[PDB]
Amino acid sequence: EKEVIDPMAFRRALGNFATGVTIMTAQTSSGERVGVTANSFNSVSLDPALVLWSIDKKSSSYRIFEEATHFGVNILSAAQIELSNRFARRSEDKFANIEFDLGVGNIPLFKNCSAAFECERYNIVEGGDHWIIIGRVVKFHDHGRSPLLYHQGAYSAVLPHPSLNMKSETAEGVFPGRLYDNMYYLLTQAVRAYQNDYQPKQLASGFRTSEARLLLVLESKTASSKCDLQREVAMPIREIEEATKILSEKGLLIDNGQHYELTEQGNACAHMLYKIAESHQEEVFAKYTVDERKLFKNMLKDLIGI
């Protein structure tokens, strides 16, 4: 006896494992290039230096990866969401107007990535409805740029710094070291404390990141179109479609032909998410004047540059 696994509910469960984001590329001697956004990448071995990913067996790009003797792994930085979206959708020329260099074996390498790996195709292994492609790394580029994150269906970023030592007996002892008493560290630890308050409440009310973002954006109806919407929620199109379907089942959203609109329940759920977020600062700043609180927001906007 083997258990039947629902594939969409299993896909949602996998969204709990955060990953960076890559684009796998290859080009033949002929001149045919492929590039495929992928988060199935991981490392295997240091010597020999080996990495792997999993490509759909129905992919139109599989033939080129199978034939080309070399392929590249581009680790996207936080600034490359547009690249990630371009190479996630079939089109006539995914590379149109992209700048890229040629590594060994004609590997296409994008500029401004967090890192890149030039691989020789090493082995191809059966993987259910995917093929597992194992590559030997023969060259790499390590730039260190802050990476693009993919988690619970949505694009995010890495929050810097180790946490405060919150059981310390001394006042300055809360900092991991005294040079962490600085404005940058304080801001990251304020975010971390806000998230620790807000996140469990959002989750206990039954919303995951991708659902939450669609509710908050669709409530305001600011350019409610498919390309405009993707840009605002920072999610893949495949994840927008999946998340509007769930919201539809919860009675929160209507998919009227071309665009999406919340229902009255959906509007109330969006507003409930706002009140949760605003709850923490309401409590923490209850004893500050309106002027002080107005001032705090303005200094925040000054660091942001708005």
Next chain:
Amino acid sequence: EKEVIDPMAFRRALGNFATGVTIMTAQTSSGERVGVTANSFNSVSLDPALVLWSIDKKSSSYRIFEEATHFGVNILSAAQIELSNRFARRSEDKFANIEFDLGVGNIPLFKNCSAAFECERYNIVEGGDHWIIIGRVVKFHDHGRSPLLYHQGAYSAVLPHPSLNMKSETAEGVFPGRLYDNMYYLLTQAVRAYQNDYQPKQLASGFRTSEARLLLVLESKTASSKCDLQREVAMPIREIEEATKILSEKGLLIDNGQHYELTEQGNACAHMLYKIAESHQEEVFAKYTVDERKLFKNMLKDLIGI
């Protein structure tokens, strides 16, 4: 003669791919049980439901994963750094004083995780100095808790929210939607902008996250133990040892046998990292009074709870 890339430079480069953190567990019919912290996990296939990970061929736990018919994947939450560290070090009893449940095939399952996957051992594939273990998922748990991240040798958290539209001619148009105009959103965008200023300057200096943290902490924690140090910098032991070896070869750190100590050049680098962080806010808040900046800092600390 066989040419290979430097394994330790390669490991550093792989640090650019962010991942979650798992513990892999198994218990055989004879009662032998294992748990291994791992971040080589990823998904393979939706139908059949397949995932994989890679384990070191010299692992003393491999024999039990090879014997057990079933194994678990526990996706760790942000609050489980202690569990992560516990299951990353060889030990007489990793499971001592740890609460856990048993799944199918007596899989050890930990409490308070982000998610967990019960697998039947499906296939073991040659992986250089690792074995690639493929699992068929027979049951999953989807809790959605904020995840533990691992990036450039160190533990971090997720920075939430879609980025604001910096090219907006209107104040409202900056936000992905109007309900994102709240304190929590503004804090995360503040962190984003700060990091976009700080990060390329820390990179230009040659430091990755693991090195930077060690510098900042060791600059004032001149006598910390190896346990306290792991807790303070939020890095596993194995990364601390790798990072201090790099810092030693750069001339920034000495290992006198008992403790780690920064050199004169190490101290100067720690203070430079501090200046970079402090310089952004110093420029932006120049126009505010001495007491206005004091008020801002005090309000941040109220948010934190210190």
